[PDB]
Amino acid sequence: LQEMKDIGVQADANAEMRARERRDRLHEALSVNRSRVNQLEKQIAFCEA
Amino acid sequence: LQEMKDIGVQADANAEMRARERRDRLHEALSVNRSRVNQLEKQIAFCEA
């Protein structure tokens, strides 16, 4: 248990599932955000010109 | 010792320094290659526009 506190992680199974779910939803949202920024940057550069 | 057989990694002191040196020089090389790719894509996108 001291080793578990030296590595500095809570390591609870229920928290592991909740954490992975929240991070995955944010990774998916970020991938969509980058894609949107890329198409709108094209629109911006083209329309301004 | 069974935990060492389960993880399946030799992890010799010499092997550890060698592994980090190769993967760290690779991490910087990836960042440089990707930066060149992004720079060339921005120039090409400007040329198209």
State how far the Cα of A20 lies from the Cα of A26, in Å rounded to an integer.
10
Name every chain B residue with its beta carbon within 8 A of the beta carbon of A46. 49
Question: Please, are residues A39 and B39 in contact by the beta-carbon 8 Å criterion?
Answer: no
CA distance A46 to chain B (A): 6
A42 touches chain B (CB under 8 A): yes
State how far the Cα of B15 lies from the Cα of B10, in Å rounded to an integer.
8
A45 touches chain B (CB under 8 A): yes
> Would you put residue B35 in left (φ > 0), alpha (ψ -120 to 50) or beta?
alpha
B13 touches chain A (CB under 8 A): no
Query: Which two tokens mark A32?
Result: 């969509």
State how far the Cα of B31 lies from the Cα of A3, in Å rounded to an integer.
35
